[PDB]
Amino acid sequence: WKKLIMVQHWPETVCEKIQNDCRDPPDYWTIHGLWPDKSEGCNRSWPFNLEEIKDLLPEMRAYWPDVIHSFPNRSRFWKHEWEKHGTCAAQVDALNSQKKYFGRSLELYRELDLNSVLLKLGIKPSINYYQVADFKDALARVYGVIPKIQCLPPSEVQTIGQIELCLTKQDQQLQNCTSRGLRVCEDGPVFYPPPK
Ligand SMILES: *[C@@H]1O[C@H](CO)[C@@H](O)[C@H](O)[C@H]1NC(C)=O
Ligand SMILES: *[C@@H]1O[C@H](CO)[C@@H](O)[C@H](O)[C@H]1NC(C)=O
Fold this sequence. Notes:
Blueprint: E1 3-9, H1 11-14, E2 30-36, H2 57-63, H3 75-89, H4 98-112, H5 114-120, E3 126-131, H6 132-143, E4 148-152, E5 159-168, E6 174-175, E7 183-184, E8 189-192
Antiparallel strand pairs: 1-2, 1-5, 3-8, 4-5, 4-7, 5-6
Bound molecules: 2-acetamido-2-deoxy-beta-D-glucopyranose (2 copies).
PDB class: hydrolase
Keywords: RNaseT2, alpha/beta fold, ribonuclease, RNA cleavage, hydrolase
Assembly: monomeric
């Protein structure tokens, strides 16, 4: 793999069942994961061990909740993220343990502060549609790199669900990059839904 992708998602869009973390979806973008771009599932002999990240659990519950399957055991999601992505990300010294990977992921989420960025730009959940360019152009100005922005299609207009920012392999600095239904958002109107 060559780069990392910091993936954040909008709970009201991605939530699938009104349970657990999705019963009242958080009203802020949360962490989906920190993913090596081209490799997954790198070490079946290195299982997730919740005990190793015990210190991070309050932050993981707040910022890395399970808002896709919303299983009652929140650690099923983090296990999935570790096994699929973290074992590969551990080739990088800064990410070379469970604690370091998850801790760095949380740090990057704090440093990027996508939630404050959007709000400062005036991009808030609304009944009124935005244009996809509102998100893309404003995030490109703030982060200096082009995000990938992914949507659920109409099941009306597409709904924004996920924002991806690429990061360098060694130091996880912002760089340019160049699913459960999320696809690239089409140019045009997009709904950014206020949580239920
Ligand atoms: C798999 O992880 C174990 C536990 O960290 C480590 O000892 C081993 O070297 C890893 N194997 C590969 C191919 O990375
Ligand atoms: C990423 O690409 C954009 C769009 O072409 C460019 O303006 C920007 O300077 C690039 N950022 C980095 C960090 O390379």
